[PDB]
Every structure is written in structure tokens, then in C-alpha cells.
Amino acid sequence: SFSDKLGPQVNSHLPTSKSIPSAIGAEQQPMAKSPIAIL
Amino acid sequence: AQMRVVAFGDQTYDCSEAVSQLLRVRDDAIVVDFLERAPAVLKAELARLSSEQQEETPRFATLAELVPRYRAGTLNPAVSQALTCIAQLGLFIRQHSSGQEAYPTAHDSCITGVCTGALTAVAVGSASSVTALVPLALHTVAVAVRLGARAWEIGSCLADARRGANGRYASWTSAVGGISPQDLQDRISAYTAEQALASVSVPYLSAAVGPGQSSVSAAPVILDAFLSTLLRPLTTTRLPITAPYHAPHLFTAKDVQHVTDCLPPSEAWPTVRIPIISFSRDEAVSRGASFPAAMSEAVRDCLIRPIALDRMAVSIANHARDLGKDSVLPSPIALSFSDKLGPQVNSHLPGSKSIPSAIGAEQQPMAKSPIAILAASGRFPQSSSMDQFWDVLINGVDTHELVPPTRWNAATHVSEDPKAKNVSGTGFGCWLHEAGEFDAAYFNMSPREAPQVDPAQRLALLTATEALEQAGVVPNRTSSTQKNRVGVWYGATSNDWMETNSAQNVDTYFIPGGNRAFIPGRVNYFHKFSGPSYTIDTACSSSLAALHMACNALWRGEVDTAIVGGTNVLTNPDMTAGLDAGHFLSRSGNCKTFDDEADGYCRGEAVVTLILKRLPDAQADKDPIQASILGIATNHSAEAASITRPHAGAQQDLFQQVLTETGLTANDISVCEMHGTGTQAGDSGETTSVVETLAPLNRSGSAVRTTPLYIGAVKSNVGHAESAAGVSSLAKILLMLKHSKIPPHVGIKTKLNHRLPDLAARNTHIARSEVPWPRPKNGKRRVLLNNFSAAGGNTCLVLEDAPEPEDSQEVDPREHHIVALSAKTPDSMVNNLTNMITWIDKHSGDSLATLPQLSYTTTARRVHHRHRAVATGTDLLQIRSSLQEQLDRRVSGERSIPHPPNGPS
Amino acid sequence: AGVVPNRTSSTQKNRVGVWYGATSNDWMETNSAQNVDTYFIPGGNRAFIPGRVNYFHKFSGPSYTIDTACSSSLAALHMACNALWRGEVDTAIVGGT
Amino acid sequence: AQMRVVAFGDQTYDCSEAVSQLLRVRDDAIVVDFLERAPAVLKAE
Amino acid sequence: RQHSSGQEAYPTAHDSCITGVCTGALTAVAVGSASSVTALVPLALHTV
Amino acid sequence: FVLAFTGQGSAFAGMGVDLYKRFASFRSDIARYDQICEGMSLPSIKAMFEDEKVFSTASPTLQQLTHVCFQMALYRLWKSLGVQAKAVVGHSLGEYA
Amino acid sequence: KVLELPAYGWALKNYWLQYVNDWSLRKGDPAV
Amino acid sequence: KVLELPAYGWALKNYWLQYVNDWSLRKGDPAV
């Protein structure tokens, strides 16, 4: 609760990212809970 | 100050068993995830191979289908490479999550690998935790399949497959002993000169193992010729490597570049944090390169560089000393001759039980957990209960008889030679003569409504309620028995009542009383179960098909308790006539399973209902457990010449499918309850599929079985219950386990069928007289049950003895106990009193713990209706005297009255 | 759907199942019942509704008929979706009659 | 030379949305396992 | 999720500390007693 | 099918370029044969399929290897499309392919 | 411990709609 | 790309077993 103010309050006593594409077949979520497509 | 070395092996290690073990895993969530996504990754790269390689690649839905071909030697280099790489990563992952092994660190460990192991080593060395390893591990799988695929391509271009291969992939590598590497290299050069071999086809030194050992590779035809010149004392051991590797004359940097092109370019690629011992390179120790660059170098170790396996030992030791370590603890993963690693590396040098899980977490996931059979009640020919059904089987009774007049008149519906329309050649059957009996008041039916209700729906309500009480199920008593967690499944192929009986005067209850959806519906409605409600029609396999659907629901978690049953009530003469017109039915008698003169099956009537639960829930509620279902599967006989006839090809694939899914082997099964409809084609076809799965024969002719196998068919006793056949067969097994006996088989009237295989040679038997079937000490009896349909579908399950009950329990310090009886009708109240008294006279002096358990059952595990009776005492004798006294008053004319509606104040 | 058996992995014959919803079998009660002949059972029984599909196109996956009265087809669609989600089949044929 | 502090809250924080998000997680294998076994543990106590 | 799906390194005594208020104090014990996400689960379930 | 393998007399410049460009499998075969040749100290044939210009100054050894590589790659292409040969006949250099 | 006790003593009566007049053998024929 | 094309041009014929003589209205009645 009220976490944002924590950062400044603690430092007062004191003086860029990226994800790699998954191997084909692995990016997809498990077959359970996967959308079933009507062809 | 010890340093563990993580060493991965190559193709020489038979990873077949390790793969089988990882597929059996179900307690490690990150492993099962890796094993679901690895085949997806594998299959994805296999689709990018050349047409030649795709044609020589098998089709598979899971890795289980590759194991047999791997063992057989008919698995191409691309898949066997990825499979070894999967087994290595899988074994490493399990060891570091399920095995709770700390992850390696650059301070106290190093990683090494030879050939394929070099790939996995890059992945492990590039991660700092198991969670980070998976995504890299999956990339490594794709690299491995591309590696073997590329070496396979060069091999096929270099040398063609030989004629007597029979699909097996020949060996490109062989180990040589008794000569130094540099001396063997000279003999190679000499052999090359004399044969004038092209530079590409020359044999080459692929690895240096020791001062006298080494490995030489070449095309199989060329390798054989060269090895023929290495005479004793030299040695020759052929290795299982099916493609050229470590060949600077065949592969170049472009080939390496191609294998690693499946690694997308990025800036976030992790670097090698843990030192990798690359003993076959200029720099024995390597670290810091990005994952792709590190992987390319590893691929280069496989295609370009020879294996300097004679430098592996000292290379590891030198790194240990470099960090001031006294010794090394080897941690090999699928490494050939791994035991010798420990001593060999240390030669260069001077030289708590797991904590119990929080309650509820020890249990394995709901998926593929044993499903416990809690209870079963039913009606069978000449049998008003499961106990009377056992009398039919153990006394070898044939219950078939001419159709009774209550169904239809055989004089007008049956003819020796049928010429008139709707007249059949047979009128036989196995009938439920009390199929009309019902308690309309109990289930809130008017006397005008009950006749309109299909006896199938009525007998479903009776059996279902009996099974529920037998299982001690009280709605909303426990978590697993909450009304919204209970589902109902029934198998029914026919609705004769609505076609022949009530149709004679269509009234208001015609649809609800005749429609099959109301068979489970009435059960849902009466007991107030809001879970799913289904009816399955797969013709003669409906009930076992429904059992399959119910088990999937439990495994998926849609329900915690399942009601499964099947019904078959015959009242329409057209169905028998139609079946006879199609030649399904026997015009002589009952099903004569295994008899040389079998001429069809005999229709049978039956209604059965069971109660199921995932084994942990069953044990949480202290429910009774008669047996456990390990697996169940379904396919279809698409490859049959006619739509009706089933075919053995599809049936065997099913039997082996369920054995693999359950992790069992032939010897583990001791009994098979076959479909056995008494057909020469059906009985011989099914028998061949069963023995080839459960009683295979050695190539020499001997029996693979160490213990006998018994096969039998219940239909020889009570006929073919059609939509209720599966559960009828299953009911027989539950009784066989209870009484520890195999009942005699009455289907053989005259002589055994000549189409059958030599059963005695396979240690298979058809019990002619009853046979003891005792449970092994600290063991379980396991069974295969089959149930097929003329529509083509096949269904079978694997069954298992129930678990051993809890030994301890506890002594009830309460001196006085209370026993509760209830009924909805004054007559039913008199009945329950009488039946309870006769029960106490049977179990009077068995044990002292009976009375506390009797109280618990009749009170906590029972519903309590409006008419009530009670008895209290300190022993069973007092309870009887009280109930007897109460019974006397009921017989003297004092009727049972329901308690006031509002209850007490 | 451009489905050719065994063309792709998902269309392998052993990866295709069939589910149908049917509450009634009137034909064998009123029409063919007027002269029961040799094809009476196979032509009237509901299990053969999906069965004929399995047999003609050579699909060896599961074959089921569901009767939940006026909800049969969606009940069958439900069973088929569970099979796909659990990996029992890669292609599912679902219908109602 | 930074030190990250991992601070957990109390009942005053409305974790309803956070729970709803975790129940919709499919891409993390170790999360879904925890969320299947946590209710089992909860239900047991 | 933050330390498996979120690709976040696990805390260590050298560069991190743990704190919790009331209910959070329980969770802090579990995290502080594990060195990886896999090791955290069994402790986490006891904490539940 | 009977497959007839031609002699070197009828080869022309830029032959197979469209095959080389559009069919990846065809390109792979040539690229593989090219690497094998250099492995055996034989001239490089990959340039013949890319440049066209080289056909003018190509040597007999290069013109003969190109012909055979062309036929092996072209045969493998047709076999991959479903053509299975009942027999083969080669004319002069065509016998090798 | 759940014991195997006798089943409920149902108050049974026969509810049946007898098939009569062998009309199934005349399906499709007219009233004659 | 899979295009939506016309369905197979079935060679259709009518296969029917007509319900006749209103016999369903007499279920349970005698021949007469």
C-alpha cells in the first residue's frame, strides 16, 4: 500500500531490456486453454 | 573445496530408457512443460527439412512414438540427435528442480560435453537458473535437429543407403583399439593411397580416446573394407553413429552458419557464465561468448573438429587447480562409460530426508491421477444385485432363454425360416424379468407417470441411488461431494420403451419418460447435482465410452465425483429382427465365445451405475475403494474392409497405447476381460491382438510371460448388454477382485476355435473351472478390459487393485453408540429394520470395531428421511434386541409414521 | 477447410476425431421399420452417424454421439474442445443432426 | 552498488486484480502449478 | 512470476534485502529462505 | 515414366537460373554439389547458375560438371514432385546422371 | 469406515405398458 | 491461401422410405 513513496523515503537517508523470440512451436501457450479455431 | 563437473555425452549412450522415465514424470511442473513444448519445437524444425528427409521421418504426436524406432535403429540422424539432446536437458532440468539440486556456478563448477553434449553444455552454461534454461534449451533442440539433418544430408550425398538395411540406419563410426592414434592415421593414409579414394570418401580419424584407443569414421561400405584390414590383436567395436561427424573435409563454416540460423539475432542473448571445458579446441576453457556464438563453436566441435577425448580428463583437472580445488565430483548426464570419469580426472590431482510438503501439495496433479471406483450397483439377468450377479458367473450359468411374453410373443415374431416382414430368426436373450419394478413414491412419481418412464431411466435411478449409499455419499457433506461438483454420464443406444410401449397411447410424459437425455437428467434432478449430465451413444461400446468421458472430466477437474452407468432394456421386436437381418445374432443360443461353432452374439439386458473419484479425494473422505482405473483410450477401426467388422490392427494399437500411458508391461497384467461377442471372426481377431500385446512370443518361440494370463468374456453368461456391456464387463472384474477368483468360462460348448493362436505356448489360458486369483503380498492385480462397437469405435481401459487401507485407525473410547435407520414409506421402514437385523446376525462377532463403524455409516454416511428408527447400546447384540423389539411393534399393527415436518423445538 | 488426410501433421488420420449431437432416430422407427431389411441397424443407429465419417475418410480418432436433448450439439462441441485441449486429437469434426 | 529491497504489504492492499491476473497466466509453467496446488493446501487447512 | 516469466534474477544477500508488514512478514520468510524459484514453491505452500 | 538424360551437346547459358532462383531445394542441391567439388579439387559450378556470363569462358571440365549437377538436381526435383521412374536412359554424358 | 450395508428396502410395484396385438409385424400395412 | 470455392457437385438422387397408411395412429390396436 502506498508503495510509490517508499523509494524516495528510503534513499532520503542515503546519498534497457528486450525479450528473444521463442523457438518455433514454443511461443504458443500450452494446448490447454488455447483458442479453438473454427475452420 | 570440491568442484563438480557437469559432463554430457553423445549418441553412443542409449537414452531410450531416460526418455521413457521423463515421460513418466508428473511431479515436476517445469519438466512436463519442457516435454510438451520440446516435441512442438522438434516437429517445427522437422517441417523445414528436405523432402527426402521428411519422407524418412516418422509421424508422431508425442515422443513416446519415437522411442521404439530409436531402439530398433530405424530413426534418422536428425531426430535421434534432437532426442538425445532432449534427454540430456530433461535429465538436467529434473535434477535441478525436482531434485532440488543447486544450479552450477562459475565459482564451484564447470560444464563439458562431447558431440551432441556440446550443444546442451552451451545452454546450461548460459543460464543461472532452471527457469532461464528452458527457453535456451528449446532453442538448443532446434539446433540439434538441424545439426543431424545437415550431417545426414552430406552422408546421403556421399554414400547411398545399402539394400539390406530394412530401414535401419547404418553405422558411420567404429572404435579401434590396440594402436596409437598417430599410427592408425598412417595406416589410413596408406589404405587411401592404394584404393585411389576420392578425398571426400576417404576414412578419417574422428576421435582420439586414449594412448591405444581411437575412433574412425567413414561411409559404411568404405568403413567395413578398411576395418577388415585391421587384424588382431587390434579391436573393432561398431558404434551407433549414423552420419558423418568431425570431418573437416566434408563440412565448412557455411554448414555451421546454416545450423545456427534458427537462432534469431538479438542483443539480449545471454553469455556463457559457467566455464565450459572445450578440450577439443585451442582454448581448453571458454567463457563469455554470447549464446549464438557459443553455440556455433559447439556445432563446430561436432562437424569440423575431431574429439580430443584423451585431453578431457586433464583439461578438467587443470581448470580445477586453476581455482585452487583439490578434487572434482563428476555429475555425468547420459555419458557413455561415465563411471571411469571420476578416477580419471582425480588422477591428475592430489585427491537429510526431504521435508514433508504442506498438506494438499503432496498430491500429484489431477491430470493422469488414478481414478478410484468407490461402488457399483446394477441389475443383470437372473440377478437383482452385484452379489447375485457373482452367483451367475462363479456357478457357470447360461442365462439365455426365449423371449418372455412380457416383451413380445415369439409365436408370431420368431420363425425358423423368417419370410414375413419384421419376423426374426432368433428370439433368444438374457432378460431382466423385474425390469418393471420401481418405487414411484421414493422418486416423486405419480402412478400414472411411472409407466410412461423408460425402465432404463427407472433402473438408472435405483442403481445410482444404491451406488451412492454404498459409497457413503451425502451431498454437500465434503468438498468432493458438493452438489456443483457431481456429474452424471450414461451409455444408451436404444429407446425401445418410447417406440413400442408408451407409443401405444402417447400421453403427457411421453418425451421426458422416453428420451435418453433424461436417463442421467433424472439422476441430476433427483439428487440435485448441478454438474454436467451426458448420454453417450457409441452402440455396443457406449458405457465404456461414457466411462472414458467421465474420467476425462475428473482428470480435467470439471468434477470431483462422477456417476457412470449404462442401460439396455429391450422391448422393441424390430431391433432384434433388424440385428438378425444383419447376421449379428446367434440363432442357436447365447454367446459362444471361443467356441469353434460360434454363430453370433445374444442380446442381453443390464443396468449398472458406478461412483468415481480421483484417488486422493476418495481417500480424503475415507470412501470405500474397490479398484482404481489407471488409463483408458479410444480409437476407431478405420482400416476395416467393411464398416461393421472390427479389425485387429486398430485394436492392438489401442492395447499398447494404454500400456504405455500407464507405464506397465505385459507381465504386469494378469487378466483380460475381452469383448468376446461369440463370433468366429471377432473372437479370433481380438484374441490375436490381446496375446500379441499381453503374451508376446520370443523370436525363438518361447513365452515372454513369466506368469500365466487368463482371458474370459462375461457375455458367455449374461449375453451382450450392448450399450451396457462395458460396465457389465467392469462389474465382473470388481467381483473377481473382491472374491479373488477367476470364474469358469461357459462359452465353449463343443471344441475350441481353431483360428486362435496356440494359447498354451504363450502361457494364456481360458479357465474351464474356477481359478484362484490371489492378490500378491505388497502387490496389485492389474486388468485389461475391452469394449467395442459395430460402428467401428474401440475402447479399453487398464484396471488396478485398490490401495492398502490405513493400518492404524484408532480405538473408539465411546462406550455407547447410536444407529440410525430411515425410510420414505412405512413398508420400506419395515424392510430396512428386517434387513439390518439379518445383517447384524451375519457380522455379529467378527470384531469390536464394527459397532462404532456401523454407527458412523448409518448416521454420517446416510441421508435421513421422514420415517425414522433408532437403537443405542454398547455392543451389536443390544442394537439387534432393540431393533427386533421395534420390528415386533411394526408387525403387530403399529405403523411407522413420519416425524412432524418442522422438526423439534 | 482444405483438409487432405495425412497432408500435414494436424491432418494425420490418427489425429482426427468426430463428434455429433443427435436426440432421435426416427428413420428406424417409422420409415425403415415398415420393412426391416439387412441394413436396418447400421442405417438407423445413431453411433453410425459419426462412424460413417470416420470410416469413409479413414479417420481413426475417437467417434462419439452425444444426446443431451435440445443441447446435444453444443454438448458435443464441448466434448470435442476438451479433446483438442487435452491433446487427444489435432482436428475435430463436430456436428448435429 | 545498488541494493534492491523486496517489500511485501498487508491486508490494506487490494490484491483482487492481482489475483485475477495470475489466474489468467498461461505462459509461465511454474505459476500455474502453484495456483493449482495453493487452493489444495488452503482447502486442507 | 516476476522471477520465472519475468526473467528477474533471484535476490541474494549481497545486493538485496527483504521486508514485509503483517502478512508480508510471512512471505518474506519464504523468499529469504530460498535461493531459486523452484526452491521457493514448497516453502511458499507451507506459508499458505 | 521413362526418364531420358541428355548429352552435353544441347546445354546453353543461363540454363536452370529460374529453377535455381525459385526452388530452394534445387538451390540447396547445387550449393551442396559445389562444396563437394571444391572438396575434391574440382572447379566451382555454383557460379554457372548465378552469373550466366561465365558460360562463355567456362572450361570443358566446368561445362561437364555443370551438366551433371544440373541433371541430378533436376531429377531430384521431379522425383520430389511425385515422378517415380520405371527406367532410365542416358545419352553419352547423360548416363552418369 | 464405510461398511457394506444392505441396500434400501424399496417398496416395489410393477409399472409396465404391455406390447399387445403384435402390431409391429404390420407396420406399413393398412387397416384390414 | 485457401479460397472459398463451390462445394462438390454431388450427383444427387432421392432415397426415401415413405411413411404410409397412417399406421402410427393405431399403435396398440388390433388389425380389424
Which chains neighbour F (Cβ–Cβ under 8 Å, 3 or more pairs)? B
Q: Kindly list the distances between the CA atom of residue C83 and the CA atoms of B493, B552, C4, C64, C90, in Å, as whole numbers in the listed order.
A: 22, 9, 21, 12, 9
Q: Rounded to whole angstroms, how far apart are CA atoms B548 and B633? A: 7
Nearest to F19 by CA among F43, F50, F47: F50
Strand partners, B561: B486, B613
B615: burial class by Cβ within 10 Å (0-12, 13-18, 19+)?
A: buried
Closest-CA distance, D34 to chain B, in angstroms, reads 9
Q: Rounded to whole angstroms, how far apart are CA atoms B394 and B378? A: 17
Backbone angles phi, psi at B112, to 5 degrees: -145, 155
Residue B171's H or E segment, with its range, is none
DSSP class of residue B290 equals B
Backbone angles phi, psi at B874, to 5 degrees: -105, -10
Q: Rounded to whole angstroms, how far apart are CA atoms B614 and E33? A: 34
Three-state SS for B204?
Answer: strand
Q: Rounded to whole angstroms, how far apart are CA atoms B896 and F7? A: 109
Residues of B annotated as part of the active site: 540, 675, 720
Backbone angles phi, psi at B483, to 5 degrees: -55, -35
Cell 512471505 sits at which residue?
Answer: E27
Contact between D38 and E18 using a beta-carbon 8 Å cutoff: no
Which chains neighbour B (Cβ–Cβ under 8 Å, 3 or more pairs)? A, C, D, E, F, G, H
What is the structure's resolution, reported in angstroms to one decimal? 2.8
- Put simply, the chain C residues between 28 and 67 with a CB less than 8 A from any chain B CB are 28-29, 33, 35-42, 44-48, 50-52, 54-55, 58-67
Cell 563438480 sits at which residue?
Answer: B4
| Interface B:E, ≥3 CB–CB pairs < 8 Å | yes
B868: burial class by Cβ within 10 Å (0-12, 13-18, 19+)?
A: middle
Interface membership of C87 toward B (CB under 8 Å): yes
Q: Kindly list the distances between the CA atom of residue B135 and the CA atoms of B116, B716, D30, in Å, as whole numbers in the listed order.
A: 18, 57, 14
Contact between G19 and B407 using a beta-carbon 8 Å cutoff: yes
Interface membership of B503 toward H (CB under 8 Å): yes
Q: Rounded to whole angstroms, how far apart are CA atoms B253 and B266? A: 21
Q: Rounded to whole angstroms, how far apart are CA atoms B13 and B341? A: 15
Nearest to B240 by CA among B7, B16, B8: B16
In sequence order, what are the residues at sequence separation of 6 or more whose Cβ sits closer than 8 angstroms to the Cβ of residue D9?
Answer: A1, A3, E20, E21, E23, E24
Through-space distance between the first and last CA atoms of chain H, rounded to whole angstroms: 67
Q: Rounded to whole angstroms, how far apart are CA atoms B785 and B592? A: 19
Cell 571458454 sits at which residue?
Answer: B286
Q: Rounded to whole angstroms, how far apart are CA atoms B133 and B135? A: 6
Q: Rounded to whole angstroms, how far apart are CA atoms C92 and C17? A: 5
Lookup: cell for B233: 590383436
Q: Kindly list the distances between the CA atom of residue B735 and the CA atoms of B352, B393, F41, in Å, as whole numbers in the listed order.
A: 44, 10, 79
Three-state SS for B570?
Answer: coil
Contact between G31 and H20 using a beta-carbon 8 Å cutoff: no
Q: Rounded to whole angstroms, how far apart are CA atoms B783 and B799? A: 5
Confirm if B724 and B568 have CB atoms less than 8 A apart: yes
Lookup: cell for B582: 444383419
Confirm if F46 and F20 have CB atoms less than 8 A apart: no
Q: Kindly list the distances between the CA atom of residue B342 and the CA atoms of B87, B103, B670, B875, C17, in Å, as whole numbers in the listed order.
A: 22, 20, 44, 69, 53
Residue numbers preceding breaks in chain B (C to N > 2.5 A):
351
- Put simply, the chain F residues between 15 and 44 with a CB less than 8 A from any chain B CB are 25, 28, 32-33, 35-36, 39-41
**Cα torsion at D21, D23, D29, D30 (round to 10°)?**
90
> What is the CB-side half-sphere exposure of residue B663 using CA atoms within 13 A?
14
Angle at B198 (CA atoms; ends B192, B201), nearest 5 degrees = 80
Which one-letter amino acid corresponds to residue B69? R
Nearest to B609 by CA among B679, B696, B708, B522: B522
Lookup: cell for B370: 488414478
- Put simply, the chain H residues between 1 and 32 with a CB less than 8 A from any chain B CB are 24, 27-28
Nearest to B559 by CA among B527, B535, B537, B530: B530
Q: Rounded to whole angstroms, how far apart are CA atoms B895 and D13? A: 64
Closest-CA distance, B369 to chain C, in angstroms, reads 14
Contact between H17 and C1 using a beta-carbon 8 Å cutoff: no
Nearest to B21 by CA among B657, B663, B665, B668: B663
Backbone angles phi, psi at B555, to 5 degrees: -65, -35
Q: Rounded to whole angstroms, how far apart are CA atoms B791 and B789? A: 5
| Interface G:H, ≥3 CB–CB pairs < 8 Å | yes
Three-state SS for G14?
Answer: strand
DSSP class of residue C28 equals I
Q: Rounded to whole angstroms, how far apart are CA atoms F86 and B446? A: 80
Contact between A26 and B40 using a beta-carbon 8 Å cutoff: yes
DSSP class of residue H8 equals P
Q: Rounded to whole angstroms, how far apart are CA atoms B268 and A21? A: 10
Lookup: cell for B779: 502387490
Q: Rounded to whole angstroms, how far apart are CA atoms B795 and B491? A: 13
Contact between E38 and B132 using a beta-carbon 8 Å cutoff: no
- Strands in D1-45 per DSSP E: 4-8
Whether residue B233 is preceded by a cis peptide bond, meaning omega within 30 degrees of 0, is yes
Lookup: cell for B46: 522437422
Q: Kindly list the distances between the CA atom of residue B229 and the CA atoms of B171, B218, B223, B225, B235, in Å, as whole numbers in the listed order.
A: 18, 14, 10, 7, 11
Q: Rounded to whole angstroms, how far apart are CA atoms B422 and B413? A: 7
Three-state SS for B628?
Answer: strand
- Strands in chain A per DSSP E: none
Cell 510509490 sits at which residue?
Answer: A4
Through-space distance between the first and last CA atoms of chain A, rounded to whole angstroms: 48
Three-state SS for B817?
Answer: strand
Burial B627-648 (b: 16+ CB within 10 A, else e): bbbbbbbbbbbbebeebbebbb
B837: burial class by Cβ within 10 Å (0-12, 13-18, 19+)?
A: middle
Q: Rounded to whole angstroms, how far apart are CA atoms F84 and G9? A: 76
**Could you tell me which chain H residue has the CA closest to the CA of B500?**
H27
**Could you tell me which chain C residue has the CA closest to the CA of H27?**
C30
- What proportions of chain F, in percent to the nearest 5, are helix, strand and coil? 60, 10, 30
Confirm if B430 and B718 have CB atoms less than 8 A apart: yes
Q: Rounded to whole angstroms, how far apart are CA atoms B546 and B279? A: 60
In sequence order, what are the residues at sequence separation of 6 or more whose Cβ sits closer than 8 angstroms to the Cβ of residue B808?
Answer: none
B869: burial class by Cβ within 10 Å (0-12, 13-18, 19+)?
A: buried
Nearest to B139 by CA among B299, B303, B282: B299
- Strands in B492-545 per DSSP E: 533-536
Measured from the Cβ of residue B415, the count of other Cβ atoms closer than 10 Å reads 15
| Interface A:B, ≥3 CB–CB pairs < 8 Å | yes
DSSP class of residue D24 equals T
Q: Rounded to whole angstroms, how far apart are CA atoms B328 and E19? A: 39
Interface membership of B556 toward C (CB under 8 Å): yes
Lookup: cell for B728: 457389465
Cell 454436467 sits at which residue?
Answer: B532
Nearest to B90 by CA among B145, B143, B138, B40: B138
- Active-site annotation holder among C70, C85, C86, C87: C70
Backbone angles phi, psi at F52, to 5 degrees: 70, -50
Q: Rounded to whole angstroms, how far apart are CA atoms C7 and B701? A: 40
Confirm if D8 and E27 have CB atoms less than 8 A apart: yes
Contact between C84 and A31 using a beta-carbon 8 Å cutoff: yes
Confirm if B674 and B680 have CB atoms less than 8 A apart: no
Domain B371-800: homologous superfamily in CATH: Thiolase/Chalcone synthase (3.40.47.10)
Which one-letter amino acid corresponds to residue B43? K
Q: Rounded to whole angstroms, how far apart are CA atoms H32 and B364? A: 70
Which of B131, B355, B358 lies closest to E37 in CB terms? B131
Which of B33, B41, B267 lies closest to A23 in CB terms? B41
Contact between C41 and B518 using a beta-carbon 8 Å cutoff: no
Which chains neighbour E (Cβ–Cβ under 8 Å, 3 or more pairs)? B, D
Angle at B870 (CA atoms; ends B866, B871), nearest 5 degrees = 170
Residue B835's H or E segment, with its range, is helix B826-842
DSSP class of residue C78 equals H
Contact between H23 and G20 using a beta-carbon 8 Å cutoff: no
Strand partners, B385: none
Lookup: cell for B284: 581448453
Lookup: cell for B297: 563453436
Q: Rounded to whole angstroms, how far apart are CA atoms B833 and D2? A: 80
Backbone angles phi, psi at B563, to 5 degrees: -105, 120
Q: Rounded to whole angstroms, how far apart are CA atoms B532 and B486? A: 7
Q: Rounded to whole angstroms, how far apart are CA atoms B625 and B803? A: 8
Please report the DSSP string for B107-139 in residue order.
Answer: TTEEEEESTHHHHHHHHHHT-SSHHHHHHHHHH
Lookup: cell for B648: 485387429
Give the mutation candidate from G25, G27, G29 for the C interface (greatest C CB count, under 10 A): G27
Q: Rounded to whole angstroms, how far apart are CA atoms B514 and B508? A: 11
Cell 551433371 sits at which residue?
Answer: F68
Contact between E16 and D6 using a beta-carbon 8 Å cutoff: yes
**Could you tell me which chain H residue has the CA closest to the CA of B498?**
H27
Q: Rounded to whole angstroms, how far apart are CA atoms B643 and B585? A: 17
Max distance between CA atoms of chain A, in angstroms, equals 63
Backbone angles phi, psi at B198, to 5 degrees: -65, 150
Contact between C47 and B515 using a beta-carbon 8 Å cutoff: no
Please report the DSSP string for F37-65 in residue order.
Answer: HHHTT----HHHHHHSGGGTT--HHHHHH
Nearest to B99 by CA among B110, B91, B107: B91
Contact between E39 and B100 using a beta-carbon 8 Å cutoff: yes
Angle at B766 (CA atoms; ends B760, B768), nearest 5 degrees = 120
Q: Rounded to whole angstroms, how far apart are CA atoms E4 and E8? A: 7
B570: burial class by Cβ within 10 Å (0-12, 13-18, 19+)?
A: buried
Which of D29, D32, D40 lies closest to B360 in CB terms? D40
Q: Rounded to whole angstroms, how far apart are CA atoms B588 and B678? A: 12
Which of G2, G3, G12 lies closest to B437 in CB terms? G12
Q: Which CB contacts under 8 angstroms, 24+ apart, belong to B652-657?
A: B652/B689, B652/B692, B652/B693, B654/B794, B654/B795, B654/B796, B655/B689, B655/B690, B655/B693, B655/B694, B655/B784, B655/B786, B655/B796, B656/B693, B657/B633
Which one-letter amino acid corresponds to residue F68? V
DSSP class of residue A36 equals P
Pair type for strands B401-402 and B428-429: antiparallel
> What is the CB-side half-sphere exposure of residue C32 using CA atoms within 13 A?
20
Burial F8-38 (b: 16+ CB within 10 A, else e): eeebeeebbeebbeebeebbebbbbbbbbbe
DSSP class of residue B385 equals S
Please report the DSSP string for B423-473 in residue order.
Answer: -BS--EEB--TTTTEE-TTTTT--TTTGGGS-HHHHHHHHHHHHHHHHTT-
Q: Rounded to whole angstroms, how far apart are CA atoms A15 and B740? A: 81
Confirm if B603 and B678 have CB atoms less than 8 A apart: no
Three-state SS for F83?
Answer: coil
Interface membership of B440 toward G (CB under 8 Å): yes
Which one-letter amino acid corresponds to residue B856? Y
Pair type for strands B2-8 and B109-113: parallel
Q: Kindly list the distances between the CA atom of residue B62 and the CA atoms of B9, B41, B93, in Å, as whole numbers in the listed order.
A: 24, 12, 19
DSSP class of residue B582 equals T
**Could you tell me which chain C residue has the CA closest to the CA of A35?**
C85
Lookup: cell for B3: 568442484
Pair type for strands B561-568 and B486-491: parallel
Pair type for strands B486-491 and B533-536: parallel
Confirm if B586 and B598 have CB atoms less than 8 A apart: yes
Sign, Cα dihedral of C29, C33, C36, C40 = negative
Pair type for strands B764-765 and B533-536: unpaired
For chain H, the C-alpha Rg in angstroms (whole number) is 22
Closest-CA distance, D39 to chain A, in angstroms, reads 19
Nearest to B300 by CA among B119, B49, B111: B119
Q: Rounded to whole angstroms, how far apart are CA atoms B814 and A24? A: 66
Three-state SS for B544?
Answer: helix
Confirm if B866 and B898 have CB atoms less than 8 A apart: yes
Q: Rounded to whole angstroms, how far apart are CA atoms B714 and B117? A: 54
Closest-CA distance, C41 to chain G, in angstroms, reads 16
| Interface A:F, ≥3 CB–CB pairs < 8 Å | no
H3: burial class by Cβ within 10 Å (0-12, 13-18, 19+)?
A: exposed
Contact between H28 and G30 using a beta-carbon 8 Å cutoff: no
Three-state SS for B640?
Answer: coil
Measured from the Cβ of residue B480, the count of other Cβ atoms closer than 10 Å reads 19
DSSP class of residue B501 equals I
Which chains neighbour D (Cβ–Cβ under 8 Å, 3 or more pairs)? A, B, E
In sequence order, what are the residues at sequence separation of 6 or more whose Cβ sits closer than 8 angstroms to the Cβ of residue B902?
Answer: none
